[PDB]
């Protein structure tokens, strides 16, 4: 099958450049287009151009000539795009997506890179139990959860039982707190008379800040 | 640029209820696409050259147009249809989208269910305080918190998240935050918050004694 697995999130100062890519598998590069559109607030899209790997050649949206470049390593077919001269208008998340020589639209896009632009560094998250309790309980469902506390930049991602428990968990979408750092929570029902039995764990991924936190959460 | 105006720009409908999004272009465009995109998610292509489907679309979705006007039509909408749209021309330089239209899908009234959450003992240590009422799985989205601190109400010192619909029940859940400094925490003992909801026809307090 088609895949396009694009590199991690990124943290860059104003100024500064990043270097982007695509891996590109289950089909022949060359034989295909790649683009590269940008998502600002989890709403806009804009095509920034493309590129035919089959012989480097890329055409670009002028908006963002020589703020972006595109290239290509054919040997490992990925696809990559430099952003330079980074500013705050430029922290968005960035996607590759497979185009056509057909008139086919993008019929497959990869999974994004979120880029911030700030002075700020980076800082993993305190993860802190939220606990069940008999205040957290109700007709034989407890809630339970993690709150994920003064991370920065954006994103985190939070599994349970590192991927086993998927029923009833809901992730909230992060607050930007008034001190400059992110913080969510991540909570999960479940049947409180396993409360005793079951172990409970939140898993929490700081790519920015190269972090992963377990954290076990248990009754009072 | 081709400017693509999508409209309307939001829309609710009950699952079985047909419905069209339009998106209207500054000139004119053939061959239009139209991508799904779920919140969190990449997009995926959806309907491609004005009315093909994409591998795996479900065959209520259907596009149509001509010169400036195309359309997307759910011919009967399901629960897991809640997601944004977005059309997008290739007809000049440089491609553009719309700005999108997102569906959210009806359903019935449910109140919150209320939970509250005391800070650990781990976060008081490092001098911070942060209690945490949850509301699971209502609907509609519109719901009122209150903290009260020892029948104090509280205001500018609470934060509340929202989550997107879920794709199966059609329902949202809801944190708010309240968070204190580590000495003005363990100056009080009662931590209550009140919720209100279109579908509550009085109060739910769920609350906790410090202790």
């Known amino acids: 099958q088609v895949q396009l697995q694009q590199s991690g999130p990124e943290l860059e100062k104003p100024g500064a450049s990043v270097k982007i890519s695509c891996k590109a598998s289950g089909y022949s590069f060359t034989g295909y287009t790649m683009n590269w559109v940008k998502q600002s607030h989890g709403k806009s899209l804009e095509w920034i151009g493309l590129i035919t790997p089959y012989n480097g050649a890329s055409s670009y949206n002028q908006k963002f000539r020589g703020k972006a470049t595109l290239t290509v390593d054919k040997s490992s077919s990925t696809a990559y795009m430099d952003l330079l001269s980074l500013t705050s208008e430029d922290s968005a998340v960035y996607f590759c997506?497979?185009?056509?020589?057909?008139?086919?639209?993008?019929?497959?896009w990869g999974s994004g890179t979120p880029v911030t632009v700030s002075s700020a560094s980076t800082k993993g998250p305190s993860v802190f139990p939220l606990a069940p309790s008999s205040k957290s309980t109700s007709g034989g469902t407890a809630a339970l959860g993690c709150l994920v506390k003064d991370y920065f930049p954006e994103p985190v991602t939070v599994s349970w039982n590192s991927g086993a428990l998927t029923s009833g968990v809901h992730t909230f979408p992060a607050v930007l707190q008034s001190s400059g750092l992110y913080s969510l929570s991540s909570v999960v029902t479940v049947p409180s008379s396993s409360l005793g039995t079951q172990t409970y764990i939140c898993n929490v991924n700081h790519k920015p800040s190269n972090t992963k936190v377990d954290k076990k959460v248990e009754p009072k | 640029d081709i400017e693509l105006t999508q409209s309307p720009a939001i829309m609710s409908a009950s699952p079985g209820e047909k419905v069209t999004m339009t998106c209207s272009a500054s000139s004119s465009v053939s061959y239009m696409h139209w991508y799904q995109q779920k919140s969190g998610t990449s997009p995926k292509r959806w309907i491609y050259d004005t009315s093909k489907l994409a591998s795996g679309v479900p065959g209520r979705f259907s596009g149509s147009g001509s010169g400036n006007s195309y359309s997307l039509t759910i011919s009967s909408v399901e629960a897991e249809d809640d997601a944004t749209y977005y059309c997008?021309?290739?007809?000049?330089?440089?491609?553009?989208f719309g700005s999108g239209t997102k569906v959210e899908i009806k359903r019935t009234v449910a109140a919150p269910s209320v939970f509250i959450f005391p800070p650990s003992d781990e976060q008081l240590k490092s001098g911070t305080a942060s209690v945490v009422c949850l509301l699971n799985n209502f609907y509609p989205r519109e719901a009122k918190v209150q903290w009260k601190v020892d029948n104090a109400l509280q205001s500018g010192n609470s934060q509340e998240s929202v989550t997107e619909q879920d794709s199966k029940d059609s329902t949202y859940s809801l944190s708010s935050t309240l968070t204190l400094s580590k000495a003005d925490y363990e100056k009080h003992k009662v931590y209550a918050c009140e919720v209100t909801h279109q579908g509550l026809s009085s109060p739910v307090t769920k609350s906790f004694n410090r202790g």
């Open positions: 997506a497979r185009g056509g020589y057909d008139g086919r639209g993008f019929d497959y």
């Open positions: 997008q021309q290739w007809s000049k330089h440089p491609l553009t």
